[PDB]
Tab-separated table of C-alpha atoms in Angstrom:
chain	number	residue	atom	x	y	z
A	19	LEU	CA	54.422	198.313	78.561
A	20	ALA	CA	53.388	198.483	74.982
A	21	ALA	CA	54.476	202.109	74.534
A	22	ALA	CA	57.467	201.318	76.403
A	23	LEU	CA	58.559	198.884	73.749
A	24	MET	CA	56.637	200.513	70.747
A	25	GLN	CA	59.110	203.674	71.201
A	26	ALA	CA	61.363	201.438	68.873
A	27	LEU	CA	59.418	202.466	65.946
């Protein structure tokens, strides 16, 4: 999940 959200950066 972390990667799924951190793609924003």
